[PDB]
Design a protein around this nucleic acid. Sequence first.
RNA 1: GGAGGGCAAGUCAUGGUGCCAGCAGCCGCGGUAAUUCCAGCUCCAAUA
RNA 2: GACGAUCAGAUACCGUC
RNA 3: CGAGGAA
RNA 4: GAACCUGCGGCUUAAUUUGACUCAACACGGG
RNA 5: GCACGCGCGUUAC
RNA 6: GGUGGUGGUGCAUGGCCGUUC
RNA 7: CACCGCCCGUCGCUUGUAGUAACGAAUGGUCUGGUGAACCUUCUGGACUGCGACAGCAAUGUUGCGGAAAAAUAAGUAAACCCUACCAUUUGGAACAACAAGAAGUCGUAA
RNA 8: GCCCAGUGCUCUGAAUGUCAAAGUGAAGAAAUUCAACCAAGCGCGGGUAAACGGCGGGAGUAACUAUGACUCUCUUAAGGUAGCCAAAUGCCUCGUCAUCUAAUUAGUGACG
RNA 9: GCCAGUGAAAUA
RNA 10: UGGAGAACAGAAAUCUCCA
RNA 11: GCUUGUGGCAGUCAAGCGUUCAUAGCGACAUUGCUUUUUGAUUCUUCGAU
RNA 12: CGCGGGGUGGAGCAGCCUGGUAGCUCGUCGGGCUCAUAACCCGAAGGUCGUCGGUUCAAAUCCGGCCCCCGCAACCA
RNA 13: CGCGGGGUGGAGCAGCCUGGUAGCUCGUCGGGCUCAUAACCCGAAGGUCGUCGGUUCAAAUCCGGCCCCCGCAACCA
Lengths: 213, 165, 141, 68, 208, 125
Amino acid sequence: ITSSQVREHVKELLKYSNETKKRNFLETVELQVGLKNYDPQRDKRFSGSLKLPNCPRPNMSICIFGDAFDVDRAKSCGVDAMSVDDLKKLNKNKKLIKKLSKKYNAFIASEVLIKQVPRLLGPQLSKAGKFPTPVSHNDDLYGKVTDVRSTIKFQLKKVLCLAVAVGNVEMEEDVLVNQILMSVNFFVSLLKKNWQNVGSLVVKSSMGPAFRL
Amino acid sequence: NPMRDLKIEKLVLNISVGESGDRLTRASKVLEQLSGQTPVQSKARYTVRTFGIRRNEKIAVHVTVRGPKAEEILERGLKVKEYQLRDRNFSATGNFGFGIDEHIDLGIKYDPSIGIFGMDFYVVMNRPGARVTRRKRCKGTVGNSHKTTKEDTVSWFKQKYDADV
Amino acid sequence: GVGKPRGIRAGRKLARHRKDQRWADNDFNKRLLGSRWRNPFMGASHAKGLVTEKIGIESKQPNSAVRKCVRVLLRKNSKKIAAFVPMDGCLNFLAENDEVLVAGLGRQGHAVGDIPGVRFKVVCVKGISLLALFKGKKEKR
Amino acid sequence: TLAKAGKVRKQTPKVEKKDKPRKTPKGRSYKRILYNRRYAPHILATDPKKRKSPNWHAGKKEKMDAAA
Amino acid sequence: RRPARCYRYQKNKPYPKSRYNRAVPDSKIRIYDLGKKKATVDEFPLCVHLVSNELEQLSSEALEAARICANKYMTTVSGRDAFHLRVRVHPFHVLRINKQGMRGAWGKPHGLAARVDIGQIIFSVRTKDSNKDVVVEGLRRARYKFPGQQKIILSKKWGFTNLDRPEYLKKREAGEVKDDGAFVKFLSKKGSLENNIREFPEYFAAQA
Amino acid sequence: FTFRGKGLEELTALASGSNSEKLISDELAALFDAKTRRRVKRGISEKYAKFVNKVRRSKEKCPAGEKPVPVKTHYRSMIVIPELVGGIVGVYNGKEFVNVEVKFDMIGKYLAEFAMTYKPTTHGK
RNA sequence: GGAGGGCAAGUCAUGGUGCCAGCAGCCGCGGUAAUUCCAGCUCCAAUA
RNA sequence: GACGAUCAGAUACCGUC
RNA sequence: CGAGGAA
RNA sequence: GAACCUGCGGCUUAAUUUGACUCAACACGGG
RNA sequence: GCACGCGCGUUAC
RNA sequence: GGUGGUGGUGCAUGGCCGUUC
RNA sequence: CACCGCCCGUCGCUUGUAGUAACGAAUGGUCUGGUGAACCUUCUGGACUGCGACAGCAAUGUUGCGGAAAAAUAAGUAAACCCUACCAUUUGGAACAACAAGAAGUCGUAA
RNA sequence: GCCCAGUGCUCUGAAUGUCAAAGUGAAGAAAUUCAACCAAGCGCGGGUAAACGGCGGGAGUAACUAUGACUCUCUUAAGGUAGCCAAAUGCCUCGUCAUCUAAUUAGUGACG
RNA sequence: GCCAGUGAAAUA
RNA sequence: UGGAGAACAGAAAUCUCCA
RNA sequence: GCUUGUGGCAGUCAAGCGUUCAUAGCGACAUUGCUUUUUGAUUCUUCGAU
RNA sequence: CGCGGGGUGGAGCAGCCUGGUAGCUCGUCGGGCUCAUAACCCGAAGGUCGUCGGUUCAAAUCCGGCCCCCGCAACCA
RNA sequence: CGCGGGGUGGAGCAGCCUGGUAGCUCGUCGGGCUCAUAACCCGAAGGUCGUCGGUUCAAAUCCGGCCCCCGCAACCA
């Protein structure tokens, strides 16, 4: 709870383990949070790294599609399909628009809708996990998929999600919790007023918990 | 002499609608496709009775071509008016120019040629001199060449062989 | 007994009673109250007068008609009189300002069923019986 | 109105009266004739219930002769 | 009206009250020639004219009355063929009246009269010889009307009339107007034509 | 630059052909609608022939001063014949005679088709 | 002086009039076929 | 008299005072 | 005209 | 309620023949 | 005869 | 002075028919 | 002519009417306080005149007596007139108002 | 007589908005500057005119004619009620008709 | 579940 | 501004040529 | 207090009224004036008494 | 005179601010309806929009200038 | 200007705090019902939700920024 105990989630919580000495292999810590919890559309992000610094952790197939040319916008990589003859029948509704825009990351496709997005395609998907975000959709979905694959930084969109990092095993305290904060930027604060907008969260590394608030 | 002279200026084609659309929105198309060039509309500087109570805008189309599509003007010269225009009888100058009335008709209608109906039966004369004083840079008064259309620009709508003399 | 008293000594009573209960008669109450003298003729049977103008009056209830009437001025009395000119052409003889002799119509009071407020008949023009002027072979001036 | 005075009489066609063929006896004579034409024994003779109207002879020339 | 006190003088330059004084109570004499118009310019010659000798304002209505009684006789003993009474004054200067109960007031127009310069010609007419006294006696009338005034003068010209110019027009027997230069003779002067003249014509232009 | 149906002249030769007998030679027959063909092929009247000639005189005698002598008729049942073009025939309708200038187009059509028989309705109340 | 009733006397298929002119003592007549108006005819009543 | 309601209208037939 | 208001 | 049909009113018209008007007028005058 | 207002009906969604 | 009249009075009328049924 | 029947009032309209009371005037009559013609009577008055005696025979004159005209007088009958009250009989008066009668006026509906 | 909307007065009233000083919280190193709540009062609600005072205006609108108890209206609390006048209030006004005069810009009696 | 997912927005 | 070409424009509302 | 427009009052000319005639009696138009109990301008005299 | 409102059948009222059509009631005149009589109803005749001009394709309609009507305002010598 | 409440048919009122449907009354317009006449009833035409944008699939509806409306508050030199 943004208090002294931050370094109790960090410093005092960095060698908890669950057995004997402390092992003999590398470490793996971070600092959990989110993306903005807005609705993955209107306003929740912009630009600027923390860091932070990471990438996947497990899988990365997100979202990118629109026309017959959006497939190759997911061929030399791996993404979801919006289909062509579906935006007039079933390419969006609940578990539909989901499918294409409901993965884990967010979305990195382009744009093309017309008079249909106030309760179907572009619509039903927003806070679900996608609704047309900033993925430099013009050359494709790879270069700006540096904001959708690796490096990172920590593009935090769709539904929660983000990253963190600072050191290895044991050598951080005030800058461990203050490294977790450092592992937060346009995700912990931003422009006009943004020093906080949530309730709680989690964190650790592999040991056991962090802040007991 | 007698070294150079005679040519067909431009084919000043113009209909005079008198509304907005989808009416002028037509005299356009019509013009445009009888044209190949596009359609320079016409203003409407100001108001009175018979409608046309609008500020300078929407009430006719201008598109007017020239040169190679020369004959493209007399492409109904002879035709449209049986190669006969304001004839008789004094000073052989029979109203250097040719009467007209509005044109148009076409939502279905069929191509032309004549048809399209009467139209802007002019785009005509006024004697001679030189070539580009309508120039740019070092501009100027044409020469002192030729006859006020008439005794000149008549004897060259007289060798498109037709009636007016 | 009945209301009336039957005493040989009570004649007076019965007498005064009759003199009293008798006022309930209009015919009585009428002549008794010198009423006849106050009418336009002053009791008289007939009256002379000057024609003030020939006016016409409308019939009443089920009848609709233009009655011929002369407004007369009685001589010594000097009253405005409504006088019905009898038979057909009659009014054609009455010239305005002539002298006329008038009499009532059936008992001085109600006018003939038809007429409205007219109580008199015209019998003479310039002292010439109307009937006389009504029949050619008689008289005319 | 007024000028509408005696409209009727003026409009009536003056018919003339049948200039007495002979005369009408005035005196005991008239009362006599009447006595004869009605109360004379030949009329009091036929039923008193079936004797004619002293003017059914409305002057009808057709029934005037049938009786006489 | 308001008498002739707003009468003959100056007291005010000349408020011709056009563009600047809008409300000129309209004129009074919208006549001017009233007579045997469309005249011959021969025919009704020898004109007698009525000159006023006194820098005054021959009022509005006044000029009217002039016309009135002018024509009255003009005709009444000589005919519609006899007159032609050229107005020849004419009535500008809109005069005004007056009416914070005495504090700075300019005039509101109040009738238009005209400035008879002492010597100027007023309501002056023109007619044939046999009309002399006719005309003359008549114009007398006016002089008696109209804040007089008076020339009742007999004339000549120029040629607004007969009019001496007598020996003149009686000399321009041959012609009418130009004359003028010497060139495009489209005033049929007689008689050949062009050829001859155009000979002599340059025949002198050449002598230079 | 306007022309006419089937050639105004071909018909004058078609109608007044070798056998210019019955007003409507079997030639003109091929041209008319079934209803008209019906009539002529059935029993057309002779009066319709003397009326014909009445227009004839009106068309020539009149100077080029384009002033035709109106021919009057009740034969509203007549079907305009080729040679009937150009003349102004007065046709009765109910009240008076109607003058109509016969154009090339009104042929094969009933002469009555132009003599308005009733004035349609204007309105107000 | 009357002839629908009271009140004696027309059941005229009479003419004119058309709620007008007018009648009517009181009932009531009259708005195109009036038994009461105007008039003819014939009737009744009292009869110098 | 003051109010509610009812009525096209209700200072009336009901209702609160 | 997509089964039709007060009636 | 819909489009036609037919009758009545209305308004037009040279003229739109006229009867009939709550069941006891209006596809009724055999219309 | 047609700006329309009624009344039997014919065909149908 | 007649004929004839899809001309007027159904409140002058026959005949017939509707309604009360 | 039978509830699409009867029917009431406000206001209006149409055609009309001058009542009862008061007041005004007219005629007549009475009361109150005065002015008061005329005449009966009264007390006067006494021209004129009759008688007797004396101045003369006589006209005339003095006086006594008697009758007696005008005048004047008081009380009285009391005409007319005025004033103060009251009665009777007639007759009069107006805009607005009022009353009378009528209706398929107007608004509603009392019975 | 009718008007409580206006101005005043005055009641427990209003579920809520201002609203000062101290008192409280937050922030700086303080000085200090931001906060939240906060009596009355205000504003909201009601009564109140033998309290100050108020008391409309135009259109149509038959049974010669002018006419309004008629309705239509636009309208502010309410739209002058009994009563009363050219009056010591009436502009035009010397109001119009009488009445008192030979005569009345006076009187009085009427009429709105 | 999810790679499928519609919809206004997908969860153990 | 005249003289030219007018189809909802045709006094013109507005369209194109020319002195 | 000037001034006199505006008020008032007289005056010339004679077209007209005055049925016959311009002036007995009056006079359009046009024009000359007097008047200082109207009114209007003006601000000289008097608010350091009217 | 200065402000502001108004003249429309024979009368009293509409139409004008929203240019193209002039309406209502009475009165005058004719007919329905009815067994008939009232009543009641229909249909006609009738306006030049005070008058003069301007915009305008078009004026009762918007705009003016005169002529009277009412209301305000007012200092004449 | 600072606080707080509000603009939705032609008028007066709803729907908004509870996103998907814009309702009522009068007025305008048509029809029922009735033997008929009132009355009474049904059905239509008509709102862009002041205006601009944002969330949103979706906005009169939640959120803003302007434009007027009312209420509080107020110290200008």
